[PDB]
Write a protein that binds this ligand. Structure first.
Ligand SMILES: CCCCCCCCCCCCCCCCCC(=O)OC[C@H](COP(=O)([O-])OCC[N+](C)(C)C)OC(=O)CCCCCCCCCCCCCCCCC
Ligand SMILES: CCCCCCCCCCCCCCCCCC(=O)OC[C@H](COP(=O)([O-])OCC[N+](C)(C)C)OC(=O)CCCCCCCCCCCCCCCCC
Ligand SMILES: *C/C=C(C)/C=C/C=C(C)/C=C/C1=C(C)CCCC1(C)C
Ligand SMILES: *C/C=C(C)/C=C/C=C(C)/C=C/C1=C(C)CCCC1(C)C
Lengths: 265, 265
């Protein structure tokens, strides 16, 4: 009556092949980009173009990726769940929980002024929290429980996406014209990246697919380069454009308040 | 070369004694209080005295406690971690992650007006997120890793407590006189309850103590009755007093803006 574990990273694997090389190279590249962006944002801080949100995101991502590179499978980075015989990437989900709220806070503070926050920002944060928590619970469970939690997380995510779309449209119609193009791209980067995470979940060992750990982590690396680093670069670019507009227009941005939008789409 | 699990709730335990009876009675009582407060807040919603935060907190607490009563040890409510041989109360920590942000959001929105949120509210939310995530990581790990994560969570918690103290002092010096007493009590209920969670952690199977699951859960039940239900009742009471003041004073609360405080203590 023995019990062998058979979790990811316990039995020795012949880590060879082009896919593993690409995997490690992409982790190293993401770490390097994150740390470089961290330094660059630290230098840009004094010009009020890079807020604490992007710096924190880059910092946390750098630690995430260094732990991935050197201790991907040693706990607590890998949570080994016994009865379900599952391997949860707890480092990945912890990084999600840290950053996604900060990404949404930066989105709600795209310009940096005071008094622009609203109750809907807090509701957005709550929905994102629920979505990611239910994703973790689905990852740590099996069977119908996992599917139910995935569905609840999907509902939370639909609400979160609707709120974020409202924020993006408001930013587009309030921010100066010079930023409009940038905003569109950022929105794409927001939706192209985020939407990747739910699908990999279905295709990986978590969920009901059969992706290798390396392929799933490669997809997550790309989705992180998109959702975090590119999104932060766009955020910093937009803030720089806003600073230039402030310099050209006596320091004040155009003032729109107590209006309505979102008609039709 | 066999491996027996020995997690909480696997080997049959003779669930008998006065302590178990008190344990189950307190879980049932907390569930009943939470659901009753949920209904009561739903009725009070239309008078703008009970916000969505307390309703959500009561709702989530009711589900937490029903799952505790009926499936405390079945996963995903109990995460069984293999190499570390630990039993993480994932339902408890999920409920923490859901509610603590909402409690802080309600604290930052004690009055309910628009434009009262600030960047410091978002930083507070980030610090609370980090604190609870590090608490979970410590719970799921062992040895020096757990101690290090506990220390980082403690630092996050000190920052969170400092921010909350600032919020409480601002509420005390901005809200009407009639509410001052209430505010003090709420602060106590906030600090008496929250400070209980770090200590039980040290004394339980999580951490480095030897509390029984039942005693730890009893302590957590009391700390939840204090931090959530009593705190929500005080929040609703304060909002009712504010509504009365608004009725007596043409609907507007006293207006204080762009001032400073926190000198000395
Ligand atoms: C892979 C699929 C996701 C990538 C495409 C996302 C996309 O089109 O978003 C950009 C667009 C940009 O739209 P937007 O609202 O960010 O830009 C506003 C532009 N005006 C005001 C002129 C309309 O966003 C969406 O269409 C988001 C819809 C939800 C997508 C997820 C479901
Ligand atoms: C068990 C220990 C915690 C219980 C006591 C908490 C307490 O005294 O808090 C109420 C008090 C009430 O203070 P307060 O700042 O909420 O009330 C403001 C009242 N004036 C402006 C007149 C000073 O809060 C604290 O002292 C919090 C300090 C941090 C406690 C945790 C360390
Ligand atoms: C930096 C990391 C980010 C932005 C991660 C985002 C992750 C998601 C949006 C995940 C969503 C979901 C799952 C992965 C599974 C359950 C269903 C969702 C939609 C909540
Ligand atoms: C509704 C539940 C609440 C308010 C739970 C609160 C929990 C804490 C404040 C926990 C704090 C910590 C630990 C339990 C362990 C690690 C150190 C702390 C301070 C982050």
């Amino acid at each position: 009556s023995c019990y062998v574990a058979d979790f990811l990273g316990m039995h020795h694997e012949s880590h060879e092949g082009a896919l593993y090389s690409v995997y490690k190279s992409l982790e190293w590249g993401c770490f390097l980009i994150s740390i470089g962006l961290f330094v660059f944002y630290l230098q840009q801080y004094r010009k009020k173009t890079a807020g604490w949100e992007v710096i924190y995101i880059a910092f946390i991502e750098s630690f995430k990726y260094i732990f991935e590179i050197f201790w991907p499978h040693n706990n607590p980075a890998q949570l080994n769940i016994y009865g379900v015989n599952k391997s949860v990437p707890w480092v990945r989900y912890m990084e999600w929980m840290i950053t996604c709220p900060v990404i949404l806070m930066a989105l709600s503070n795209i310009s940096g002024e005071e008094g622009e926050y609203t109750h809907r920002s807090m509701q957005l944060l709550a929905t994102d929290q629920g979505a990611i928590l239910c994703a973790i619970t689905a990852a740590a469970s099996e069977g119908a429980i996992s599917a139910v939690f995935y569905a609840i997380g999907v509902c939370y995510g639909i609400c979160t996406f609707y709120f974020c779309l409202q924020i993006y449209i408001e930013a587009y119609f309030t921010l100066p014209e010079t930023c409009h193009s940038a905003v569109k791209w950022m929105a794409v980067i927001f939706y192209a990246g985020w939407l990747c995470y739910p699908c990999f979940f279905l295709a990986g060992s978590e969920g009901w697919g059969n992706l290798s750990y390396e392929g799933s982590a490669i997809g997550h690396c790309i989705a992180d380069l998109l959702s975090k680093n590119a999104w932060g670069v766009m955020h910093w670019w937009i803030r720089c454009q806003l600073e230039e507009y402030k310099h050209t227009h006596n320091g004040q941005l155009p003032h729109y308040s107590l209006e309505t939008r979102a008609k039709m789409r």
